[PDB]
């Protein structure tokens, strides 16, 4: 019953089904097969080179299927017609999709989402344009071939004795339509060869995703042994809802899914708010409403005070609008495809949303609540077509005495003024003229480089847009007095946008801005970026400061979603708190010059006036903002993008003039016939003459934009602070119009989202209605619009930053992709990529995913990542070597290798992955392996692994490879500009640098910093990576040939560093009983393996999570801005070890100045080490990423309280050693809780037997002072630790 056997058997049968005739034995470490490709064969034929047996080897390998290349068999991948063994189901959705197919004559060239267009056997221009749009729109990306997914779905369905409907429609398709398309295994992005409709890939991809969900719930319910889910006191079938949504969203999935996702979220938010009694979870935190010191006590039930309020007009209107929105969705679906179906169970749910109770303490309600949020993931990434539209200046609201636009501008300017003053109060100041050329690299993470830069290597010319390379190559030309005074307000000088995908919404568009514009924005907006990122502020309206009011910068800073959103759980369980969340529609459009631009530029100018004395290359400040913001530079600027195309007739193109066909400089898509100007195209455009498409070339089609742009350095700051002004106006107005009805307790602003915690002092209906009306009227008067359909005003529910809380519990939503990807990923390191994916799956299972299904998915993916990456390499007689010779007798063959699934559970350090079969949150290590095999209870789990750990071949990794052939023609002219006063002084003097070089600084000395930063920037660039990948094969053969099937477990990984294996020096004992009372936590929706861990060990109440030395150092280096990407803590430790001990603070400060470090960060870091002086050791802690995932940061582990409660250690051990012991203890206690073993305190025991004490004494002496670097590094023997070692264990 152990998972390690059924999972292995399942994946093995998947292997046979993918590759018939395989000999993939379980015990073998890997399997090697050969494959044939004739793509090189025809081109070698055409150029006069001859071969031996033409295609005859196909003719025999398909049938007799025993071609042997040095005895290694050659197999073929299974065709579509036999993937599901020819089964059929006659699904209604199949003919629904058949009816959805539409001929080419109905094409809309400017559709956001393409429809289901049929492919024609003949070729014509319109369908070549359809192909062009489909290849970059309708595509899959991903990292695994889809056929692997299909085989997995088929066999998993067979194993579960259940059939998913997506598999049914896939089988019904392939039964009669055979091969839909082709995918390159080496290059997954090469999808081609459409057969039936141009929409068939995503469909199948979507048909896959639904299947996973149909399995997920099917497993999840099995872990709770419930027959059906619960809605109040009514049974409900989840697969019915899923198939219902499926048959609805079939014909045009992207658009209708996007426009229909919102009512689901509204429903799940509003469920159960008006139940007559209500069940909540007790909570306790600080006086402030944003406090994070929350603990949880008990479940209770209490009468609902607000039960009478829900009969108001506002709630009735919200319900009406939501339901009618569902009606337009269903009628549009019924109009597009000839179907008569509807969404029954959803309206039976929705008609009584307010009154039906909600039960957090029952799993049946909770799983449903998460499931409705998780439904929307089926369609992939919402790739959407974009268009260019003018700003249409006539619609914006001019200021007038009947409105409040001038008041909003005044308040936002004033708010900016105190924002800058509060930034200055923390000694944050603008950059000096030298500091500007030092640190324009300080640009915000939202910025995008407009112009590209060229890299020349030896010959080969590449283009790039990275901030680092662009700055390093052409920053001196950014602020030169030639490019600064020009304006981007003409056809010759414009700016070009970019596109980016998001997991759920449509394809977002971004603005690419030249550095000559962002740098003046940088100078005035950078200190705000540094300041507002701070966390833990006060959100009281009567507080003078505004630092704590902004949540921007407090985004994933803690790292645990449950931890940093505890205020939502606290306030959602309070009977005295009414929350209001306001969101806008077309918000960024409404940021106009009347309400957003003029006041903000005036505030910037007023705040920069005190600093006007500073001469930025002879430019005065106000004129520098004029560069930064002004007419023709940012405002009223033309932007390029998609060429607008108009539909005409080919005959009309024949009647056109030759001069009208004069193509200009602007590029045109190959499927579109170009003309000169738009005006001559207007002469022949016709709605009924569907023959051809025409695009202009004179450049009269690109748009003109005047509103805010997402490419600026302080976009989020500006939007949030505008939100702050609007919020102040609404509070003032509601206070004026109704005194005492609503009192505001807390306000928060982040991005385009606002949140208010208030107390409502009434239960009357009409008063609430008039209050809501006043709020909406104020928002309308502020030159904006707030949608009442999705505006939130509720007692018992909180939503913030995609986090949902209902009645004190955490209701997760699963939106992480598992099949698709936002952008093409090239796996330069299979091990690191697999670690990233197991991190993602840990998060997903923490959000309520099934644990065992996650293990199955990872055991699938752990074998096919490395395949198809090997080329130009052949293995004969167990020796790996280069591709044949000039003989070319077997030039058409390639080697494919398949790893073993169980390699998922063998530690890194060997050739494996650190996953643990008992619980994914535990990191497998060598010491963990030996303890796991020393525990009896785990034996049945360990048995399949028990015979494999020594047969895993080395993995692929290109980034480690480096060569002396790295010569680039592009050089440096800017390291002298980024040089700060200390290194500039060092380089300026003639010959003191020779005296400087005697210091142990090494490669980061002045002069050498330039070459180091060129080296780092070049190795972090993808321009030259193809050459390294091509050359890497030889070293790969060398590594495989040198591979030895031996396992060693070297206790000391390296002389300077130490790991958790050190903990195996001593013996560990278990004794003593502890309190068995289970704790309380809000995330009740968990798998049992995680649930028992959260039960035995409570939530992390302590903010501190303990801190090693190196992590203290890099957290200090976080304050530094310019060198966070170049200076690691390892170099600092190396220098401090090599520098000596007896130095003072100022000596270290000077050394850090010669390290180019800022003086205040250096002062803090030197003070830290001078405090840590006496008990400081020379040891480095190398942890294998343990206790760093999503779930563990929620547990009360690796804290001081945890150490005092669970661990007792001898006093002899120093700080780094007890840190390693603590990590070992965390792993062991988590493991023991997972298996259900009784909880006991752990003892570190040292026996009085003299031989043992001598052995540990010798080992510690070797560890602290090794025989190898005692020669090289010439360490001082006067450190307190090494002296204490003399009689420590005597």
């Amino acid at each position: 019953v152990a998972i390690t056997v059924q999972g292995a058997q399942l994946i093995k049968r998947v292997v046979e089904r993918f590759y018939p005739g395989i000999a993939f034995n379980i015990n073998e470490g890997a399997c090697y097969i050969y494959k044939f490709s004739d793509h090189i064969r025809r081109i070698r034929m055409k150029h006069g080179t001859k071969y031996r047996r033409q295609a005859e080897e196909i003719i025999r390998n398909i049938s007799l299927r025993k071609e042997r290349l040095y005895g290694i068999p050659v197999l073929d991948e299974v065709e579509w017609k036999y993937v599901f063994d020819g089964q059929t189901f006659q699904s209604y959705a199949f003919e629904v999709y058949v009816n959805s197919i539409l001929p080419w004559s109905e094409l809309d060239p400017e559709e956001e989402f393409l429809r289901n267009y049929r492919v024609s056997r003949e070729m014509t221009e319109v369908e070549k344009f359809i192909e062009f749009r489909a290849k970059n729109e309708m595509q899959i990306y991903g990292d695994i071939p889809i056929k692997v997914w299909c085989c997995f779905i088929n066999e998993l369905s067979a194993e579960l004795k259940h059939v998913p409907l997506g598999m049914q429609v896939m089988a019904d398709f392939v039964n009669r339509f055979d091969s839909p398309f082709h995918q390159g295994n080496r290059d997954l992005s090469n999808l081609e060869d459409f057969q039936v409709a141009y929409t068939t890939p995503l469909l199948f991809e979507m048909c896959c995703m639904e299947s996973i969900l149909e399995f997920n719930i099917k497993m999840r319910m099995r872990e709770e042994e419930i027959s059906a889910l619960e809605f109040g006191d009514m049974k409900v079938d989840p697969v019915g809802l899923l198939r219902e949504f499926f048959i609805l969203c079939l014909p045009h999935p992207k658009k209708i899914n996007n426009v229909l996702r919102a009512p689901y979220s509204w429903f799940v938010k509003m469920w159960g708010v008006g139940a007559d009694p209500i069940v909540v979870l007790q909570s306790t935190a600080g006086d402030d409403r944003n406090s994070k010191d929350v603990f949880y006590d008990k479940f209770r039930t209490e009468p609902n005070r607000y039960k009478a309020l829900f009969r108001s007009s506002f709630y009735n209107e919200s319900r009406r609008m939501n339901e009618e929105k569902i009606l337009e969705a269903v009628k549009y679906s019924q109009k597009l495809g000839s179907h008569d179906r509807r969404l029954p169970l959803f309206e039976k749910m929705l008609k009584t949303v307010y009154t039906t109770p909600f039960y957090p303490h029952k799993s049946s309600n909770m799983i449903l609540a998460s499931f409705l949020l998780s439904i929307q993931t089926i369609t992939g990434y919402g790739r959407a077509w974009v268009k260019n539209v003018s700003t249409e200046f006539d619609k914006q609201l001019k200021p007038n005495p009947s409105n409040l636009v001038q008041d909003v501008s005044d308040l936002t300017r004033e708010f900016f003024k105190q924002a800058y003053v509060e930034a200055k109060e923390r000694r944050e100041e603008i950059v000096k003229p030298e500091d500007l050329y030092t640190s324009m690299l300080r640009l915000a993470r939202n910025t995008s480089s407009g112009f590209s830069t060229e890299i020349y290597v030896k010959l080969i010319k590449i283009n790039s847009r990275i901030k680092a390379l662009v700055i390093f190559t052409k920053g001196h030309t950014v602020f030169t007095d030639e490019e600064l005074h020009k304006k981007y307000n003409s056809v010759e000088l414009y700016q070009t946008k970019g596109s980016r995908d998001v997991p759920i919404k449509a394809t977002r568009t971004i603005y690419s801005i030249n550095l000559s514009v962002l740098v003046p924005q940088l100078i005035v907006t950078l200190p705000l970026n540094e300041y507002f990122s701070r966390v833990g502020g006060i959100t009281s309206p009567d507080y003078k400061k505004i630092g704590g009011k902004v949540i921007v910068g407090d985004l994933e800073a803690t790292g645990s979603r449950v931890m940093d959103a505890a205020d939502c759980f606290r306030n959602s369980a309070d009977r005295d708190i009414f929350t209001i969340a306001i969101d806008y529609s077309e918000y960024d459009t409404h940021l106009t010059r009347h309400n957003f631009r003029t006041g903000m530029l005036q505030g910037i100018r007023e705040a920069m006036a005190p600093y006007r004395d500073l001469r930025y290359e002879g430019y005065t400040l106000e004129q520098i903002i004029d560069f930064g913001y002004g007419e023709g530079r940012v405002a009223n600027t033309l932007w390029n993008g998609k060429r607008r195309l108009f539909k005409t007739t080919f005959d009309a193109y024949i009647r056109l003039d030759e001069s009208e066909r004069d193509k200009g400089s602007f590029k045109v898509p190959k499927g579109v016939l170009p003309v000169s100007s738009v005006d001559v195209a207007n002469r022949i455009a016709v709605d009924k003459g569907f023959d051809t498409l025409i695009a202009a070339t004179d450049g009269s089609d690109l748009a003109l934009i005047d509103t805010h742009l997402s490419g600026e350095n302080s976009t989020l700051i500006a939007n949030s602070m505008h939100n702050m002004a609007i919020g102040t106006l609404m509070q003032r107005e509601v206070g004026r119009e109704q005194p005492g009805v609503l009192t505001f307790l807390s306000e928060q602003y982040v991005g385009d989202d606002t949140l208010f915690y208030t107390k409502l002092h009434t239960t009357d209906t009409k008063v609430f209605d008039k209050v809501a009306a006043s709020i909406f009227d104020t928002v309308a008067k502020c030159g904006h619009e707030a949608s009442p359909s999705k505006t939130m005003m509720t007692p018992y529910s909180v939503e913030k930053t995609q986090t949902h809380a209902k009645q004190g519990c955490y209701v997760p939503q699963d939106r992480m992709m598992i099949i698709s990807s936002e952008r093409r990923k090239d796996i330069e390191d299979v091990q690191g990529y697999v670690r990233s994916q197991v991190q993602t799956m840990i998060t997903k299972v923490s959000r309520g995913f099934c644990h065992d299904l996650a293990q199955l998915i990872l055991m699938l993916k752990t074998t096919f990542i490395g395949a198809w990456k090997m080329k130009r390499t052949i293995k004969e007689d167990a020796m790996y070597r280069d591709r044949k010779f000039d003989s070319n007798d077997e030039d058409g063959f390639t080697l494919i290798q398949i790893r073993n699934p169980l390699a998922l559970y063998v530690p890194i350090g060997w050739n494996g992955y650190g996953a643990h079969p008992a619980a994914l949150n535990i990191v497998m290590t060598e010491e963990m392996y030996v303890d796991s095999i020393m525990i009896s209870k785990l034996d049945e789990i360990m048995a399949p692994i028990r015979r494999i750990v020594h047969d895993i071949p080395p993995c692929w990794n290109e980034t480690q490879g480096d060569k002396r052939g790295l010569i680039s023609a592009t050089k440096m002219s800017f390291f002298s500009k980024m040089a700060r006063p200390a290194v500039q002084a060092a380089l300026s003097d003639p010959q003191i640098i020779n005296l400087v070089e005697e210091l142990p600084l090494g490669e980061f000395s002045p002069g050498r910093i330039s070459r180091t930063m060129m080296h780092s920037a070049l190795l972090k660039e993808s321009s030259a990576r193809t050459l390294l990948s091509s050359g890497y094969e030889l070293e790969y053969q060398k590594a495989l040939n040198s591979w030895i099937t031996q396992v060693s477990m070297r206790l000391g990984e390296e002389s300077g560093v130490i790991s958790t294996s050190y903990a195996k020096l001593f013996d560990v004992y278990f004794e003593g009983e502890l309190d068995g009372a289970p704790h309380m936590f809000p995330d009740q929706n968990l798998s049992p393996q995680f649930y028992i861990q959260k039960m035995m060990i409570g939530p992390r109440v302590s903010s501190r999570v303990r801190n090693s030395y190196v992590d203290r150092i890099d957290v200090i280096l976080r304050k530094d801005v310019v060198m966070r990407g170049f200076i690691t803590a390892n170099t600092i430790l190396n220098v401090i070890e090599k520098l000596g001990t007896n130095h003072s603070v100022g000596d270290l400060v000077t050394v850090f100045t010669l390290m180019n470090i800022e003086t205040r960060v250096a002062e803090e870091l030197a003070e830290y080490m001078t405090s840590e002086k006496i008990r400081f050791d020379a040891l480095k802690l190398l942890k294998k990423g343990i206790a760093g995932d999503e779930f563990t940061m929620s547990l009360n582990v690796a804290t001081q309280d945890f150490i005092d409660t669970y661990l007792a250690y001898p006093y002899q051990l120093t700080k780094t050693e007890v840190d390693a012991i603590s990590l070992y203890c965390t792993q062991m206690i988590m493991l023991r809780a997972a298996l259900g073993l009784p909880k006991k305190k752990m003892k570190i025991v040292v026996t009085d037997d003299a031989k043992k004490r001598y052995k540990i004494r010798l080992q510690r002496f070797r560890t602290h002072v090794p025989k190898i670097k005692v020669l090289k590094k010439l360490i001082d023997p006067n450190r307190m630790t090494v002296r204490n070692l003399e009689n420590q264990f005597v």
Partner: peptide, 21 residues
């Protein structure tokens, strides 16, 4: 009933020397 103590590597080397000698 309960999982035993986890022996240090030095006890394992003692068993090594016992087996070889």
């Amino acid at each position: 009933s309960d999982s035993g103590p986890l022996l240090s590597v030095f006890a394992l080397q003692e068993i090594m020397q016992k087996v070889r000698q």
